[PDB]
Write a protein that binds this ligand. Structure first.
Ligand SMILES: C[C@@H](O[C@H]1OCCN(Cc2nn[nH]c2CN(C)C)[C@H]1c1ccc(F)cc1)c1cc(C(F)(F)F)cc(C(F)(F)F)c1
Length: 479
């Protein structure tokens, strides 16, 4: 194959160059910047080290030697070249595994920051030793066996049939360096993905006080007038009427508590929702009975709900189960002060200076919180509402960042998942299924696959600057 010569020279050349340049600069960016030294990035340093700085430079040249059995330098490089890719890739993927579980803990169990700076260094050291210890039984025992034309090296022990032994060692390193750790990360990012991406999020353009006219006080005067009410402290509920999930039953209980008290004359309620006919009845029952209570069962314009949020003083969110708390956000963006049950996404979102938090299912604490809110309405709540808006927007952006980060890590894991699949199944095939040498395509495919698997090493540094801006601007600094 004369035509195909310089083709696969350029093929490997781009790999080594892009791989090494990319990864060495990654390590430089992480260490040079004032604090990028987070444990995730530390494992990414070890990744960059094992994956490209070492693997590309040792492997490519040697497999290029090994195409026609040229063996320019055989020396000890046979056993090194045989030993090293196993260690380097082990160290790489388990650095990437390390990150997958750093994010697992940070997101799922944020209360225990398990990994210190020291511990992180220990991990990197441990991984390397286990990587070389997995590799040595095959690496150390590579023997060059001299023939008339060529000198070529391999690793075997024939005491029992080659299948029995070979199959075992082969499948062990294959499953340990590829299949199992990919299963583990797959799990970790599946559940972290579920956590971050379960919620679509809210339109921060749509829910903004900007689209409303006049003062909030005028808007409340107007809104209550439309319901035939005099001005007072206004509370609002929006959600499905149900026993199990949302807590309209508890609001109704709390309203009936308050009805027997004098301060109830200074309150205004707006209950919005559809569901359990009994709870619609209960709500409408109190509507007729008292008349500082208004119930809406009809479907409402998104714009009208924004008006409500941006007019009422407080929003009640007495959930049992609320994994997202999108109501809190929409309310807080529009300056409604949330009086929420502490559950799921509501304890995450609401701070001490942000809203009032109460125990779910307790009409006692809820009725009191409503009365607290009444006493608070006698002061200036404006700064309270400012806090809510800032918090709601802050929370939103935190989540966006966390998502963008974990995305990037999934991408780099999906890379290895791709490139190295053909490489392993290629070596795994001639066992249960005897090799087909029937086609004229033999060496060329080995080259193409090996090229892909080796090209995995030059992908990550590109993926880093393409997803994450911090790396990209780190590139902007020098190149
Ligand atoms: C695709 C995968 O091959 C290895 O596992 C499958 C069997 N491969 C052939 C092999 N080598 N020694 N013993 C055997 C099995 N025996 C029956 C011939 C493995 C392998 C291939 C090339 C090596 F340098 C080291 C290991 C693999 C290759 C490479 C490398 F070629 F790039 F070096 C590296 C790795 C690893 F990720 F482990 F580093 C795996």
């Amino acid at each position: 194959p004369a035509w195909q010569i310089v083709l696969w020279a350029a093929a490997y050349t781009v790999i080594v160059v892009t791989s090494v340049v990319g990864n060495v600069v990654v390590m430089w960016i992480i260490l040079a910047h004032k604090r990028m030294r987070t444990v995730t990035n530390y494992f990414l340093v070890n990744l960059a080290f094992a994956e490209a700085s070492m693997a590309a430079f040792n492997t490519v040249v040697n497999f290029t030697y090994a195409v026609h059995n040229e063996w320019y330098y055989g020396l000890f490089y046979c056993k090194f070249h045989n030993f090293f890719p196993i260690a380097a890739v082990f160290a790489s993927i388990y650095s990437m595994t390390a990150v997958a579980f750093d994010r697992y803990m940070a997101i799922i169990h944020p209360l225990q920051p398990r990994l210190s700076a020291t511990a992180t260094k220990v991990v990197i050291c441990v991984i390397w030793v286990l990587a070389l210890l997995l590799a040595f039984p095959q690496g150390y025992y590579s023997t060059t066996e001299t023939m008339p034309s060529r000198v070529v090296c391999m690793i075997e022990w024939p005491e029992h049939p080659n299948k029995i032994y070979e199959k075992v060692y082969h499948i062990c390193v294959t499953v340990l360096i590829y299949f199992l750790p990919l299963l583990v990360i797959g799990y970790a990012y599946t559940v972290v993905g579920i956590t971050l991406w379960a919620s679509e999020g809210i339109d921060c353009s749509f829910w903004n006080e900007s689209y409303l006219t006049g003062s909030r006080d005028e808007r409340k005067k107007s809104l209550l007038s439309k319901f035939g009410m005099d001005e007072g402290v206004t509370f609002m509920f929006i959600g499905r009427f149900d026993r199990g999930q949302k807590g309209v039953d508890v609001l109704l209980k709390a309203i009936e508590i308050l009805s027997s008290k004098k301060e109830f004359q200074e309150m205004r309620f707006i209950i919005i929702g559809k569901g359990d006919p009994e709870l619609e009845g209960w709500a409408r029952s109190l509507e007729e009975k008292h008349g500082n209570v208004k119930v809406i069962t009809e479907m409402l314009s998104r714009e009208f709900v924004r008006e409500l949020y941006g007019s009422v003083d407080f929003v009640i969110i007495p959930s049992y189960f609320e994994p997202f708390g999108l109501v809190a956000l929409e309310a807080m963006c529009l300056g409604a002060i949330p009086i929420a049950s502490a559950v799921g996404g509501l304890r995450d979102i609401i701070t001490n200076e942000t809203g009032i938090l109460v125990k779910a299912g307790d009409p006692g604490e809820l009725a009191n919180a409503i009365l607290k809110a009444l006493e608070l309405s006698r002061s200036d709540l404006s700064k309270f509402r400012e806090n809510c808006k800032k918090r709601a927007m802050s929370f939103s952006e935190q989540v966006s960042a966390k998502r963008k980060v974990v995305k990037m890590m999934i991408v780099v894991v999906c890379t290895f998942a791709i490139c190295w699949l053909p490489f392993h199944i290629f070596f795994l095939l001639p066992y249960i299924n005897p090799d087909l040498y029937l086609k004229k395509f033999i060496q060329q495919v080995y080259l193409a696959i090996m090229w892909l698997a080796m090209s995995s090493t030059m992908y990550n540094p590109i993926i880093y600057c393409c997803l994450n801006d911090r790396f990209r601007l780190g590139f902007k600094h020098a190149f």
